[PDB]
Amino acid sequence: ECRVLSIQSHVVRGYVGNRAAMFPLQVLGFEVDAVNSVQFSNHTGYAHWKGQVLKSQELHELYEGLKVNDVNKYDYVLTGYTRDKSFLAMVVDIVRELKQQNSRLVYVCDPVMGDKSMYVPQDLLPVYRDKVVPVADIITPNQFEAELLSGRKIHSQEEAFEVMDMLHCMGPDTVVITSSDLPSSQGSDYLIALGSQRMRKPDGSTVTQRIRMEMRKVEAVFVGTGDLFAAMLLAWTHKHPDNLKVACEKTVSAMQHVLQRTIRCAKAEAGEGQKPSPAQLELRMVQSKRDIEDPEIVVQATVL
């Protein structure tokens, strides 16, 4: 009954892009139309990868194939890692058309550009800033990406929430900073994620719910975690459209279950005292099915 248009990458092996997004959404009861932006043997963090990428016009052809059959009707649009601005532009056009057809459609966008350094071309920052985010309704930046989009560096929680208010003003009524460098109150092994939802009264007035979350840090580099986060937040905010606290609690708890199982299995595969390889660190998503369906709450968000 709830259909999501997910335009993301495909990997033969592993869980990034649509591989990390469609399984949890399907298991949580969402219908998914998946446009695969690329097909690689595996994600680029491996020592090697081979495959091909889809051209923006090819994406357009697929969308028109759906349209002429009159099955271009969606409740959600979901996007993530992209390296070509033509593709982003086409995505924006599609989102505009669908929003003209459905006033209530929700565009969930993970604005993937960099972390801590930019790993996408610089000319994408303007596109995300001036074309994509303005038509987005939920965004899942990290601190670096929030700073790049806002043009202001974040040095404190207050500055972070002011940046998130700026991002709200740019478009999205829901903004989650997934990772940050702010200090946790439980020590160096816990990380901070902030959340802000701008809800609208019967008047034109704004009321912004703000939450802060601390989650333990797993000692490994994972790929696809942001795609999985964005998909599960889509699902849980759909279940809890006015309670960002609960949605984020469920999402982060599911993430923590998945990543804890993954790290344990990964160091099982590798020898004791051996750093697991990227191949050994692939998210154990199959084995996490139930955790994704009904996660045990292991994190508590503070409403501020």
Ligand X SMILES: Nc1ncnc2c1ncn2[C@@H]1O[C@H](COP(=O)(O)OP(=O)(O)OP(O)(O)=S)[C@@H](O)[C@H]1O
Which of ligand X, a second copy, ligand D95, none binds 35 (CB below 5-8 Å, type-dependent)? a second copy
Instruction: Give the residue with the Cβ less far from a second copy, 70 or 123.
Output: 70
93 binds a second copy (CB under 8 A): no
List 75, 137, 227, 291, catalytic entry: 227
How far is the C-alpha of 20 from the C-alpha of 22, rounded, in Å? Answer: 6
| Cα distances (Å, whole numbers) of residue 38 to 104, 112, 227 | 29, 16, 15
Binding mask 34-63 for a second copy (x = CB under 8 A): xxx--xxxx---xxxxxxx-x---x--xxx
Tell whether residue 37 is among the known ligand binding residues. Answer: no
Tell whether residue 44 is among the known ligand binding residues. Answer: yes
Which of a second copy, ligand D95, ligand X, none binds 13 (CB below 5-8 Å, type-dependent)? a second copy
Which of ligand X, ligand D95, a second copy, none binds 83 (CB below 5-8 Å, type-dependent)? ligand D95
Q: How far is the CB of 199 from ligand D95 (least distance, A)?
A: 33
How far is the C-alpha of 11 from the C-alpha of 36, rounded, in Å? Answer: 9
Residue 113 dihedral angles phi and psi, to the nearest 5°: -135, -40
Among 104, 202, 219, 286, binds a second copy (CB under 8 A): 286
Q: How far is the CB of 217 from a second copy (least distance, A)?
A: 26
Tell whether residue 165 is among the known ligand binding residues. Answer: no
Tell whether residue 42 is among the known ligand binding residues. Answer: no
Closest CA to 77 of 162, 28, 139: 139
The answer to whether residue 227 is catalytic is yes
Tell whether residue 9 is among the known ligand binding residues. Answer: yes
Residues that bind ligand D95 (CB under 6 A): 9, 11, 16, 38, 40, 43-44, 49, 53, 81-84
Binding residue positions for pyridoxal: 9, 44
User: Residues comprising the binding site for ATP?
Assistant: 110, 142-145, 178-179, 218-220, 225
Catalytic annotation, residues: 227
- Contacts with a second copy, residue ranges (CB under 8 A): 10, 12-13, 19, 23, 26-27, 29-31, 33-36, 39-42, 46-52, 54, 58, 61-66, 68-71, 279, 285-287, 289
